[PDB]
RNA sequence: AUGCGA
């Protein structure tokens, strides 16, 4: 029932946080589980 | 390559299944061996194929229409030939001066099915040839039929011959439902040989009865190889036999009067080494017949290809280079793997 | 060092445990008990 | 019931290498 | 000589762009493209 | 339907419209059983992901 | 909502059934893909799979070109597309 | 014509360099040559192990890896071999051959 | 001890029967390895001239074209393979077929109706004419230097009366066949024997004599010459234990399997190797021994690689 | 390499790619055929070909089949030898199966390939035969000790188990003893092994060597016992009939 | 569709042996068994290829269409 | 957000998911010439070549492990025991 | 869609 989610959703005004590993892949979006639970940085040299 | 099973019941004949031999009387080895024989696969002797063994061929007709388009004679044009001479004269390579192939021609995916000029184009223009693998042209049928004038011959049904050897993949089953693919073609040198001077055309793994219980397989050799020794077909129809005349008496002693084995197996040698095996391996001849399902032809690669529109995806189809799906379970799956860049 | 890393997807991981042993399988019993 | 009946011809059909049925 | 066999009456016959798609000697109106001798390289496997 | 009858003795026409009803019933138990597998994994498997 | 097997609006769109977003956006077609038949092999490692080298041929990797890698990558190209680890094509930078 | 540049093969992460071990890679054999070949090698007094092995049949290819003692080389201790191989060969066609007009 | 020369002391040959196409012969004494080489060689590395690339330049038949030129490869041709070269790759086609790489064979067969048959079937052959397509049309064409080298070993099928078509009036079959020297382990239609196997001598170890009617009853449960009675009331001898055929059937008896042992003499093998017809079975043996030489030949000319 | 039966994520794995010369098919080990649920009957396998390092990354250290050893549901191991493979260790571990020093030496180098990786040797090592006298002889136990022996690190003690087999004692004889599986130090002291030793129930051998090793020592096992047995099987084979 | 050229077990050329066998059940009134020994076939490799062979080619013939009918 | 360094209080272990991005965002790197602090030593496959670099843990990266807060803790891979 | 490998 997609489009009753979609209506309670928008009646809401309702913001998606993005969190949920499904809309996640449904945006594009870096899975947040396992190696997507954490970041990686880079240590540069300063001089 | 077609055979009359040794072994069948009496309404093979009488329902003449004899006139469409679906099959062939086999040398089969039950045995482990190669290790390429487990659960569902087993080996053919490679050499038994360059023999010809189940050697089959695949047929497939076309119908190049040109009256779809119709509609009041007129602005019809399309005619097999040339026109512009600009087009490639190696297209005579395969097609003659009237548009159509030499039948016998070989053909690759790509090479011109025939050739026609449309004024409108004032181009002589072809219909491609779309298949993985190449055919030879094997009829071109002339349709003016049906038809209220159209002189210009403008159906064509073009069959061609499409060889389909025995490989890696094909599926081959026993009269018993047991199905395999053939795993590799073993060189005849690395087969088992028996004394008898002889290594088997198929083998099968042992381990595969006891699941199945297959036994019918088991006379079914035994009787085979007895009515090959005396040379006669044996009669297969149930309960023609009683729990007090077994086949395995009936054909095992009838065998033992030929000069084999009552128990029906033979001592054979390991082609790779040479040593006598531990015991006598279970042979004997056993019709074996080759599904059309070749879904070895069922292999598909696709690194680039189509996409729809609505998607900008890859389409659908082996034959349309289409490309597999990952499913909600296998994304699912994935993510069960942590894998989260893989399924990204 | 037997301890679960961080960021385990134990949840499908539990989601698989109970459905792929579920093909195998007085009161209700089998699938439609753990469907119920 | 009756018994399927045994072949008649029901002889030798097999020989070492080397040798025939002039000794059989 | 182009030929074209008649499905119907085995007469063989060498059709034109220029005469109907028929047999002659039938009146049949499928046609069967006659080999010819042209040569076709072969493995012999 | 108790058949004495066996495999290597093979079985009495009775007996082998017995060991067909019993290899149906597998098989229709066997084809159906994997169909009713699908909606537990996915309706639960959505939630715990 | 309308007064047949109509033609489909836009509701009876990517929801429903399968559709888009179960059909095609929680899983799709995918490109560097195979499928094909498969077949016992104890030569090769457990771990390892046996590819026909259809495949071998057909299948690419997108290789950054390097000073390491140079040649390698080079040797791939002087196969050609048509050899063994050859390389079908090139990505200029 | 030119000396066989790769007929064998020496796998030097299969060799020693202290002294006796090798791997050598034959391309286009088997067992054939490979069974009559361990046979006799381990006919050397001075082998301790010898074997081979094919990767795959489809890779037509035939290793064989001989560790010998201190006392010979893998290269030598093959050389033998072959030469046991040759000489042995002459004596098989020449008992043929002589069984062959004792007819 | 042991030296290659105590082999030669130890091995033995005994020829059994030696026909121009079969040889039944016995190496004592030897290793099981070396028979299998000499097997395995015989079969798949002896080189043998067969059909390789067949032209049609037409066929009508109801016989399929691909299927008819795996046929016509099939055939055994009687030649002598010394005849020619191998045929390389590294060169286009016109290269590739030379008088001295291949041998080319005609077939031009034209399928007619006999001038009227009688009666009804009238046969075929009596209805019509060159209905059966035989190997012994296959026309040998020789160029020049082999047209004289023949004079003497012509180009003939190994066996004339191989049916190979059967047409019907108005089929013709014009094809052109390049016989090329090929391996019997490339192809098995280059495999120059039909069967080379071996077999080790059976042994019939007599545990205790029997005698009488258990002795000649024990007697009949062997292929009939194996065991032989002198008298019967001492023992039941072994007349040859080369006759069996190791079929195993006394052990379904006790009145001797109690008192049998069935084993083999490790040394001792019984080849049987039959031909072709390409060549004498022994000759083929000899290229066998020969060419396993020629390989150690090689092993040794080869420089040690790294 | 995922299969059809997506059910769960042990049906999708990652694998080392091989390229076969002259093949049309996918080949794949037996060890995995129990985990895809997967049989040669005419079953369809799809390949993925990742075009990222970090998911090639993943494909070596997630997906791998090492890090499929144990099922999650229930940590029983999964990928074990079947049928044949099974059998064969049944024939050669009797504790009647005698080996020259020619072949003993010649399963080993068999089973063995030090240019694979195979070792942490770069030379072989082998047992002093069963038999002094009569005729120096190998058993089969002996072989599995040599093996062992070969592929783990020699710089460790080897493992210890004390484990029990799927055979009654019964069968091999009224004061024989064969259920009960000994390994000391790396080295088999008496049984056979099965189903429950080498197959992908757990513990066993297999399991034990997991477990003390690590899964690349344990996947290294099974190609070696594959390699084994599938030769073994050549100089014996397997054979059943009516008369069994 | 025709009598195999060498039985695929064996490699004993067989398609000579054919039309006599044919003959020879014919014209010699003989049995399968006794026309086989007399042909040569001693092994159930070349018992089997020539005793189960169905030459259909005889059915095919008669759709020849390159004569009239 | 910033947990200090003090202040953390994770596992010391990095994670076999930790572990392999890490190789692989590495490796990645250095096949887009990331500048390579160890010897090249035949290898041209740069995953194997950043598995080199894992060994002697020279990979200039930090683990920004988050917390469902958003809070995180960037730990070395100079730290972290790799095993 | 149906059938199919299953
Ligand atoms: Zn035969």
């Known amino acids: 029932t997609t489009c009753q989610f979609l209506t309670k959703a928008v009646l809401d005004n309702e913001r998606e946080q993005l969190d949920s590993p499904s809309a996640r892949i449904v945006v594009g979006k870096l899975n947040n589980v396992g190696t997507g639970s954490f970041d990686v940085l880079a240590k540069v040299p300063n001089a | 390559t077609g055979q009359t099973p040794i072994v069948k019941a009496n309404l093979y004949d009488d329902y003449g299944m004899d006139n469409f031999p679906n099959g062939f009387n086999a040398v089969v080895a039950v045995i482990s061996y190669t290790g390429y024989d487990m659960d569902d696969a087993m080996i053919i002797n490679k050499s038994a194929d360059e023999r010809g063994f189940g050697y089959g061929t695949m047929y497939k007709t076309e119908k190049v229409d040109l009256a779809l388009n119709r509609n009041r004679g007129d602005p019809i044009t399309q005619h097999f030939g040339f026109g512009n001479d600009e087009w490639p004269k190696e297209w005579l390579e395969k097609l003659d001066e009237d548009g159509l192939p030499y039948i016998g021609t070989y053909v690759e995916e790509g090479d011109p099915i025939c050739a026609y000029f449309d004024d409108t184009l004032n181009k002589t223009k072809i219909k491609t040839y779309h298949s993985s693998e190449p055919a030879y042209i094997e009829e071109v049928n002339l349709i003016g039929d049906e038809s209220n004038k159209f002189q210009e011959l403008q159906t064509v049904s073009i069959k061609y011959r499409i060889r389909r050897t025995p490989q890696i993949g094909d599926k081959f089953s026993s009269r018993h439902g047991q199905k395999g693919v053939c795993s590799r073609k073993w060189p005849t040198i690395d087969m088992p040989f028996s004394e008898t001077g002889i290594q088997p055309d198929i083998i099968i793994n042992p381990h595969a009865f006891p699941s199945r219980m297959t036994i019918g397989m088991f006379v079914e050799s035994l009787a085979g190889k007895a009515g090959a020794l005396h040379g006669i077909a044996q009669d297969s129809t149930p309960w023609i036999f009683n729990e007090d005349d077994t086949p395995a008496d009936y054909f095992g002693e009838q065998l033992a009067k030929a000069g084999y084995n009552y128990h029906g197996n033979e001592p054979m040698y390991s082609g790779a080494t040479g040593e006598e095996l531990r015991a006598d391996i279970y042979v004997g001849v056993v019709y074996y017949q080759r599904l059309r399902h070749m879904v070895n032809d069922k292999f598909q690669v696709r690194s680039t290809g189509p996409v729809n529109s609505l998607t900008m995806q890859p389409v659908k189809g082996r034959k349309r280079h289409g490309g597999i799906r990952v499913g909600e379970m296998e994304r699912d799956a994935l993510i069960g793997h942590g894998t989260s860049f893989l399924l990204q | 060092r037997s301890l679960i890393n961080p960021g385990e997807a134990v949840g499908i991981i539990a989601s698989q445990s109970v459905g792929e042993p579920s093909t195998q399988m007085n009161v209700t019993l089998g699938i439609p008990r753990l469907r119920e | 019931r009756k018994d399927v009946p045994k072949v008649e011809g029901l002889k030798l059909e097999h020989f070492a290498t080397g040798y025939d049925a002039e000794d059989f | ?45 | 339907g108790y058949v004495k009858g066996r495999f290597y003795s093979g079985i009495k026409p009775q007996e082998y419209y017995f060991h067909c009803m019993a290899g149906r019933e597998g098989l229709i138990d066997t084809a159906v059983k994997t169909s009713r597998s699908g909606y537990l994994q996915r309706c639960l498997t959505k939630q715990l992901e | 909502k309308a007064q047949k097997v109509p033609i489909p609006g836009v509701k009876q769109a990517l929801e429903k059934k399968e559709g888009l977003f179960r059909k095609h956006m929680m899983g799709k077609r995918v490109n560097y893909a195979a499928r094909s038949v498969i077949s016992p092999d104890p030569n090769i490692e457990t771990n390892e799979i046996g590819v026909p080298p259809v495949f071998a041929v057909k299948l690419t990797y997108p290789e950054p070109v390097t000073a390491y890698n140079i040649a390698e990558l080079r040797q791939a190209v002087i196969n050609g597309p048509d050899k063994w680890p050859g390389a079908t094509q090139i990505q200029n930078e | 014509e030119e000396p066989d540049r790769e007929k064998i093969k020496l796998l030097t992460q299969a060799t020693s360099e202290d002294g006796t071990s090798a791997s050598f890679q034959i391309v286009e054999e088997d067992h054939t040559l490979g069974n009559a070949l361990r046979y006799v090698i381990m006919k050397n007094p001075d082998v301790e192990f010898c074997g081979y092995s094919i990767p795959h049949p489809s890779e037509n290819l035939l290793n064989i890896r001989i560790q010998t003692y201190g006392e010979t080389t893998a290269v030598d201790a093959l050389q033998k071999g072959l030469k046991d191989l040759m000489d042995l060969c002459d004596v098989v066609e020449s008992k043929f051959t002589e069984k062959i007009k004792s007819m | 001890e042991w030296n290659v020369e105590k082999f030669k002391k130890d091995f033995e040959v005994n020829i059994s029967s030696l026909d121009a196409r079969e040889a039944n012969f016995d190496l004592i004494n030897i290793d099981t390895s070396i028979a299998n080489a000499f097997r395995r060689i015989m079969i798949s590395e002896v080189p043998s001239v067969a059909a390789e690339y067949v032209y049609f330049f037409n066929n009508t038949s109801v016989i399929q074209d691909e299927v008819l030129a795996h046929r016509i490869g099939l055939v055994p041709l009687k030649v002598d393979p010394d005849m020619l070269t191998w045929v390389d790759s590294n060169l286009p086609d016109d290269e590739k077929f030379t008088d001295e790489n291949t041998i080319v064979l005609s077939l031009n067969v034209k399928c007619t109706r006999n001038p009227d048959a009688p009666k009804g079937s009238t046969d075929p052959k009596e209805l019509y004419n060159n209905a059966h397509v035989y190997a012994r049309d296959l026309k040998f064409e020789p160029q020049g230097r082999q047209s004289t080298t023949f004079a003497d070993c012509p180009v003939v099928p190994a066996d004339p009366d191989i049916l190979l078509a059967k047409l019907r009036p108005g089929q013709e079959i014009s094809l052109k066949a390049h016989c090329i020297l090929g391996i019997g382990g490339d192809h098995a239609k280059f495999s120059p024997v039909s069967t080379a196997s071996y077999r080790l001598l059976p042994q019939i170890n007599i545990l205790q004599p029997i005698k009488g009617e258990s002795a000649r009853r024990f007697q009949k449960c062997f292929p009939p010459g194996v065991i032989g009675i002198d008298e019967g009331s001492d023992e039941a001898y072994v007349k040859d234990a080369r006759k069996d055929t190791v079929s195993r059937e006394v052990l379904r008896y006790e009145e001797f399997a109690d008192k049998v042992k069935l084993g083999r003499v490790r040394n001792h093998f019984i080849f049987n190797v039959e031909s072709a017809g390409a060549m004498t079975p022994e000759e083929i043996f000899f290229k066998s021994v020969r060419i396993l030489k020629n390989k150690a030949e090689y092993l040794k000319n080869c420089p040690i690689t790294q | 390499m995922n299969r059809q039966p997506t059910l769960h994520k042990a049906s999708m794995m990652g694998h080392k790619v091989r390229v076969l010369p002259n093949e049309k098919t996918l080949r794949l080990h037996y060890a995995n055929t129990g985990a895809y649920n997967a049989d040669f009957d005419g079953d369809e396998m799809n390949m993925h070909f990742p075009q990222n390092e970090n998911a090639r990354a993943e494909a070596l250290n997630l997906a791998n089949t090492d890090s499929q050893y144990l099922t999650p549901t229930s940590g029983s191991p999964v990928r074990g030898l079947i049928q044949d493979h099974i059998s064969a260790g049944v024939w050669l571990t009797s504790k009647d199966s005698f080996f020259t020093r020619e072949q003993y030496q010649q399963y080993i180098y068999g089973c063995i390939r030090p240019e694979d990786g195979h070792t942490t040797r770069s030379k072989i090592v082998t047992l002093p035969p069963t038999i002094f006298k009569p005729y120096p002889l190998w058993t089969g136990k002996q072989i599995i000790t040599t093996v062992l022996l070969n592929v783990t690190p020699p710089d460790m003690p080897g493992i210890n188990l004390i484990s029990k087999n799927k055979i009654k004692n019964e069968y091999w004889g009224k004061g024989s003893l064969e259920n009960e599986v000994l390994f000391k130090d790396g080295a088999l002291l008496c049984g056979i092994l099965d189903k429950s030793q080498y197959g992908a129930s757990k513990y066993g051998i297999v399991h034990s060597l997991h477990e003390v090793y690590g899964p690349e020592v344990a996947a290294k096992v099974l190609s070696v016992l594959g390699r084994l047995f599938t030769n073994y099987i050549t100089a014996t084979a397997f054979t059943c009939g009516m008369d069994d | 569709m025709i009598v195999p050229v060498r039985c695929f077990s064996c490699g004993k050329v067989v398609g000579d042996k054919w039309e006599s066998y044919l003959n020879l059940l014919q014209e010699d009134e003989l049995d399968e068994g006794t026309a086989l020994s007399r042909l040569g076939l001693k092994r159930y490799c070349c018992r089997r290829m020539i005793l189960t062979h169905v030459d259909l080619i005889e059915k095919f013939l008669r759709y020849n269409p390159l004569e009239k009918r | 957000k910033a947990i200090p360094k003090d202040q953390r209080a994770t596992t010391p272990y990095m994670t076999k998911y930790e572990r392999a991005r890490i190789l692989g965002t590495r490796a990645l790197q250095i096949s887009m010439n990331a500048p390579v602090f160890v010897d090249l030593e035949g290898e041209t496959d740069p995953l194997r070549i950043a598995m080199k670099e894992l060994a002697e843990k020279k990979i200039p990266l930090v683990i920004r492990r988050y917390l469902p807060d958003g809070s995180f803790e960037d730990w070395s891979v100079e730290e972290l025991i790799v095993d």
Not at chain 5, 4 to 32: N, Q
């Open chain 5, 1 to 45: 000589t182009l030929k074209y066999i008649c499905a119907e009456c085995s007469s063989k016959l060498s059709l034109s762009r220029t005469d109907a798609v028929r047999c002659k000697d039938c009146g049949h109106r499928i046609l069967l493209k006659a080999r010819t001798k042209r040569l076709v390289q072969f493995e012999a496997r």
